[PDB]
Amino acid sequence: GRVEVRVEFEGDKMRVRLRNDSSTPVEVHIKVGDEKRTVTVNPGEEVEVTFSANDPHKFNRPQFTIEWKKGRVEVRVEFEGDKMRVRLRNDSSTPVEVHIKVGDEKRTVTVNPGEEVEVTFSANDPHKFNRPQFTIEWG
Ligand SMILES: [Tb+3]
Ligand SMILES: [Tb+3]
Ligand SMILES: [Tb+3]
C-alpha cells in the first residue's frame, strides 16, 4: 500500500493531490482554519482538493487524516517562522513508513501504532515549503 499526498500553495490556494496506490478505499480529511474537506479516494484514483483564503496565512496549520475502513493516520503541518514541523500520529494496528519531500530535503520515518513523530525542516528560503509532499506506506 501507498497513499501519496502532494500540497501546492500557488497563491491564495492550497491545492492537495491525493493518490491511493493501494487495494482498499481510503477516506481523507483536510482541515485549514474553519474549512474541513473530505473525499473518498478509490484504489488507483487521484483526487484534487482545493482550499481558498484571501489571507494565505490562514493555511499555517493544515491537518490531514487518512482513514481505512478502523485505521487512521493523522498528519499536522505547522509553518512557524523559517521552520516546517510535520507531526505524524499512527492510530492503526500496523507500522507505516512516511516518506517526506520538501524541496531538496527527503526524509523517511517509521511510525508504530500509538507513536507520534515530529520532524522539523529548516528554510533559508520559505519558498522551499511551497510544494511539500508525503507518502504513507503499509502492506
Ligand atoms: Tb501546480
Ligand atoms: Tb466518512
Ligand atoms: Tb473510518
Author numbering: 1 to 69, 83 to 152
Task: Give the authors' words.
We computationally grafted an EF-hand calcium-binding motif (DKDGDGYISAAE; PDB 1NKF35) in the β-hairpin bridge of scIg12 (loop connecting both domains) by designing N- and C-terminal linkers (short and structured) to integrate the motif into the scaffold. Among the three most rigid designs identified by MD, we selected scIg12 + EF3a (loop sequence KDDKDGDGYISAAEK) for experimental characterization as it was the design with AlphaFold2 predictions of highest confidence (pLDDT > 90 for the five models and across all residue positions) and most similar to the design (Cα-RMSD < 1 Å). We also noted by MD that the structural rigidity of the binding motif increased in the presence of calcium and that the interactions of the four EF-hand binding residues (D71, D75, and E82 through their acidic sidechain and Y77 through the backbone oxygen atom) remained nearly constant throughout the simulation. We ordered a synthetic gene encoding for the design, and was found to be well-expressed in E. coli, soluble, and monomeric by SEC-MALS. Terbium-binding titrations were monitored at 544 nm with scIg12 + EF3a at 10 μM final concentration, and showed a hyperbolic increase in luminescence that was fitted to a 1:1 binding model, which gave an estimated Kd of 5.1 μM. Calcium was found to compete with terbium for the same binding site, but with much lower affinity (Kd = 1.3 mM)—this is expected given the lower charge density of calcium compared to terbium and hence weaker electrostatic interactions with the EF-hand motif. Lastly, we succeeded in solving the crystal structure of scIg12 + EF3a in a complex with terbium at 2.8 Å resolution by molecular replacement using the design model. The structure of the scaffold was found nearly identical to the design model (Cα-RMSD of 1.2 Å) and the parent scIg12 crystal structure (Cα-RMSD of 0.7 Å), which underscores the robustness of the extended β-sandwich scaffold to a 15-residue loop insertion.
